[PDB]
Every structure is written in C-alpha cells, then in structure tokens.
C-alpha cells in the first residue's frame, strides 16, 4: 500500500483496476456513474479460501458484538509506526453500525469454520449523499478489517466484492468511504490536525515530542485552557433541539460539495449526546433560540507495548455549525469541554472551514492524510475545504 501519492503513482492495482472507479492517472471532467446499474445480481456469496465461511453479525447479541470489538481492538487501523491502534468501544460500534436503515446482512463477517473465530469484517450503512448537483442514495463502507494472521492472502478484495454484491441486492450502486492509503481515485484529500489537551501524557507516549526550542514547562503553559467555556447559553443538546439542529445542519452544509443529507431521525441518531460516544452542545441565546452547535465523538486508541500508559483518549471533531457565534469561539469551547471531560487530544480535519481556526487555536498538523472516495461515481476532485462529510 501507499500512503503518499508519490508511491501510489509507482503502483499497479490488480484489484482496483477491475472496479468501477477512475484511474489514478486521469483527470475527471464528467459527472455520473462509471457504469450503469446492474439489473441482475449474483445470488451466491463469493468463494472464500478453504476453511472459512461468511457470517452476518447480529450486533444485538452482546457476545457477537464483543467478538467484533475484540477483532477490531487487535487487528484494526494503526498509525505508521505501529505505536497506536484504534480502540472503538462496543457501544460506539452500535452507534456507527446501527443508524436508521441499517441491515443485518451489511455487517459482513468472516469466521474460521472449525473454531468459529471471527477473522474478518466489513460493513455498509445507507446514507443519502449530496455530491455537486446530484443527490444519491449510497452506502458508507467502514471497518474493513482482516485478522493479522490472514493478511496478504487476497481476503480484502473478497470482502469488498461481497459487500458490493449485498449492496447491489438492495438496489444501491454508489458508495462513499475514506482511507489512509492512496487508492484509485480520491475525490478529495484531508489532513488530520491535533490539539494537545494533556501534553505531558502525549509526550511520554511519543504521540508528540517537545520542540528543541521549547521546554516542558512552556509547552504545558502554551496549551493551558480555561476551566469553563465562554459562549453564553452553551448547553448539551436535548430532545427538544432535534428539529432545529436538523435545520441548522441542513442549511450549513449547502455551501460544500460532498455532504450527507440527513432526515430528522438521522440527526437524532448522529447528534443526540451519548456518554463516551458522541457529544453535542447547542447555543440557546437570550431569546431562547438555538443558533449554533458543536459536536465531537469519542474514539480512544490502544498504546501498544507501553508498560504504564495503555490508552490515549481522543476526541474527534464532527459537525460544527455557526450562524451567530463565531466559529473560532465555538471550537474554543469545544476544546474546553473536551479538556473538562478527560480527553488527552482533540483531533480535527482540514475540511469544511476548519482551516480558519486550526493554527489560531494551536493545533499541530498530523502525519496522516485521510482520502475520500466515491465508488461508481465519476466527478471532479475538490479541495479539502469543500468536503462536508465526516465519517467515524
């Protein structure tokens, strides 16, 4: 795999060349499907290597959810230097995998026939996506995982082909997804930035280190935050705020070129606060009207091979809508709330309007690009600031 576009240019994509996506080399000047909708779909699951079987995961069974948690906790995405690994909690996985419209067969697992050991996974959830001037029912693909012992044995193309078939069976022919690797072919490239909240811990674990020109004392002072947020009438989102959060979000996203289109039920699901999953705060002003909101989700990571520090508590910027409060004060209160809640770092991408506040609010640029992709949709690429979609 290639994280850089440099190394990607020097690569051949035996699998991705067979798929309906534009080549890495060409530039796209059209808008529409790479290939037409299929009117007959393969009825049989693709063949797995001998010894392995498909199994749709009922995440409502606490034991099956636990197996999925353990598979991801041990085999999911790591940083470049194999220092950190995502540690999605069981309850988070329920939030991300059972939004409105979710289907059991779209939680696509692979098991060992003898042991029943879950060794592979991929998922789809449905979502209406707005891309330039078109609104399409698509799926979001996420959590593509192959066990470390099964790696490099051609299993990931099978999982991709099998989730495609199951999606095609439901009448859907486009998908959106992200990855840290360069693949054919990104619709846009975003970059993670990080805002230190607990800088001591971040340096001891080598998520960060000191500037040569700054001491630990200075570094702590530079990242010191106030104890309480500054914005008047900031408060956690409540049931009564669902219509207006939906309204503010819908109008705010119209300025970008790749966005979700959410029903009001989807807004409840994605934004209604769940402890250790998703936080949303609204701004109710002096007239009683909600004019702004901020949101971030909770995604800790395992710290591998460390005798003292085992986990890194990370908050991830989600959707932040401003119409009266300045965005920079909105994100300043997000940092304070994340600090108050015990987070060690606050992550945000450079998409939407985030660049206007990243340097001012003392974020440091990360080493990982997040690539955005459409499947079976040909359209021009776009700068990060036009991307208005945040996955988990």
């Amino acid at each position: 795999p290639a994280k850089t576009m440099e190394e990607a240019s020097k690569r051949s994509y035996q699998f991705w060349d067979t798929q309906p996506v534009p080549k890495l080399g060409e530039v796209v000047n059209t808008h529409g499907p790479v290939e037409p909708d299929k009117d007959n779909i393969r009825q049989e699951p693709y063949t797995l290597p001998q010894g392995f079987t498909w199994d749709a995961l009922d995440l409502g069974d606490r034991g099956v959810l636990k197996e999925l948690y353990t598979l991801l906790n041990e085999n999911y995405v790591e940083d470049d230097d194999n220092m950190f690994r995502f540690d999605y909690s069981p309850e988070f996985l329920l939030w991300a995998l059972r939004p409105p419209g979710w289907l059991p067969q779209w939680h696509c697992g692979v098991r060992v026939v003898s042991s029943r050991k879950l060794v592979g996974f991929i998922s789809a959830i449905p979502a209406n996506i707005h891309i330039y001037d078109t609104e399409k029912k698509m799926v979001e693909i996420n959590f593509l995982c192959v066990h470390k012992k099964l790696r490099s044995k051609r299993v990931a193309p099978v999982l991709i082909r099998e989730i495609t078939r199951r999606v095609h069976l439901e009448g859907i022919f486009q998908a959106v997804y992200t990855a840290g690797v360069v693949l054919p072919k990104p619709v846009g490239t975003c970059r993670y930035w990080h805002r230190s909240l607990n800088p001591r811990k971040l340096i001891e674990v080598k998520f960060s280190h000191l500037s040569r020109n700054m001491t630990m004392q200075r570094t702590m002072k530079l990242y010191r935050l106030p104890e309480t947020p500054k914005t008047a009438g900031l408060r956690p989102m409540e049931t009564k705020d669902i219509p207006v959060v939906h309204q503010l979000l819908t109008r705010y996203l119209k300025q970008f070129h790749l966005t979700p289109v959410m029903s009001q039920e989807e807004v409840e699901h994605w934004f209604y606060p769940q402890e250790n999953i998703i936080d949303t705060f609204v701004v109710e002003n002096a007239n009683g009207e909600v004019t702004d909101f901020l949101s971030f989700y909770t995604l800790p990571s395992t710290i591998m091979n460390h005798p003292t520090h085992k986990s890194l508590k990370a908050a991830y910027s989600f959707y932040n809508v401003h119409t009266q409060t300045p965005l920079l004060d909105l994100m300043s209160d997000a940092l304070v709330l994340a600090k108050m809640k015990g987070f060690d770092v606050f992550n945000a991408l450079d998409l939407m309007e985030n660049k206007t506040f990243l340097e001012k609010l003392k974020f440091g640029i990360g080493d990982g690009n997040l690539q955005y992709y459409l499947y079976n949709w040909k359209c021009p690429s776009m700068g990060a600031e036009k991307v208005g979609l945040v996955l988990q």
Partner: peptide, 8 residues
Amino acid sequence: GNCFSKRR
C-alpha cells in the same frame, strides 16, 4: 475506515 494520525 478512518486513519490514525499523530503529530508531524
């Protein structure tokens, strides 16, 4: 999936 990032 997502992608893990760290500083630099």
